From a paper:
HLA-A*24:02 allele, highly prevalent in Indigenous populations, is associated with influenza-induced mortality, although the basis for this association is unclear. Here, we define CD8+ T-cell immune landscapes against IAV and IBV, restricted by the mortality-associated HLA-A24 allomorph. We identify immunodominant protective CD8+ T-cell epitopes, one towards IAV and six towards IBV, with A24/PB2550–558-specific CD8+ T cells being cross-reactive between IAV and IBV. Consistent with the HLA-A24 peptide-binding motif generated by NetMHC4.037,38 motif viewer, enrichment of Tyr/Phe at P2 and Phe/Leu/Ile at P9 were observed.
Residue numbers in the entry:
A (entry chain A): 1 to 275
B (entry chain B): 1 to 99
C (entry chain C): 1 to 10
The structure:
Amino acid sequence: GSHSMRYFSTSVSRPGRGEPRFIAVGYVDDTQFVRFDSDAASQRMEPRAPWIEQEGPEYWDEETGKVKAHSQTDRENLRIALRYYNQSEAGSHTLQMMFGCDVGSDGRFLRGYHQYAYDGKDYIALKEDLRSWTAADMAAQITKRKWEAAHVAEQQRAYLEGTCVDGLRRYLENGKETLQRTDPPKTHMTHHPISDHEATLRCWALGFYPAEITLTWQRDGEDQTQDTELVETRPAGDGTFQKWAAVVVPSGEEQRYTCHVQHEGLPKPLTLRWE
Amino acid sequence: IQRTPKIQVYSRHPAENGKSNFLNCYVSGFHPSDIEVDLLKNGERIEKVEHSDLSFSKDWSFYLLYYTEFTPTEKDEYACRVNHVTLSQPKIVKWDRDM
Amino acid sequence: IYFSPIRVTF
Ligand SMILES: [Mg+2]
């Protein structure tokens, strides 16, 4: 029963139109708890979940300070990648970052992240051992080189194995009621005729937490993947997820097919038959 | 270089004609992040359409959820109109209570 | 808990 904390940062340049907008969001497993936006009136880290509001006012001052510092670094990081890649002064570019950690059911350190992507492709990344970096290309190698000399991994190793896991532990403790909960999927089945020759059999999973789900069709107890339409897990908007798997079935063959749901709120995988 | 959004128009709770719900338009796998999402009622733009804060997944691709309240009726029609640099023109996806 | 400043650029 693992748990994770992640921070997703984006810095999108807009040349001639002021400084780049920086957004940052924090997530504890599939729930968002924080937000910061450089293009916002407040200019502060703001809560996005009930349980983070129980943090003292000093938290909000320190968090605002830390996110503000990174935003500044990322605007110069955008200007450096631009000269590194011999790219024109014209044109919008994106620098994204992901950092955070993974913990055990007991709270032990499992894994730690700290990585960037420039214009949607990997730039630099801290390796699993947290001592070394992966440089995607040549520009990133210049950074690899700069960061090795500057003991950046050493510092992030301490953040990742220390601050991160501890901070996660208290978010899990404070956010017990909503995070440690497991919402089972409410299943149902729909049937829509394509023609008098065939029909679509849709099978839904609604209101579930976390987003890890598995939906699989079977024709006569043998796994189907030939004519299966499987949409991406989508948020319902209330902090729960939705998913469905459709299948093309000839008229009358509907009783040969079964939908199979695997969720960590389900003791045994639910089987679904029409009707 | 760039990726196209994968659009999904659906509701929070199952649709029932006459009950208040939430109309959702989830967009993902796109690049860059600048995207224009509009929720429509009978082809007209709904005003005061809230959206999630810009996030991405482990594979660096963005995702957003635009949403508003709505009371479904057999009479009225819903859809979301999406714009991105990867589309020569706005993409319209109608709302089917069945998908 | 956001990471403390890294005062090292690209
Ligand atoms: Mg647990």
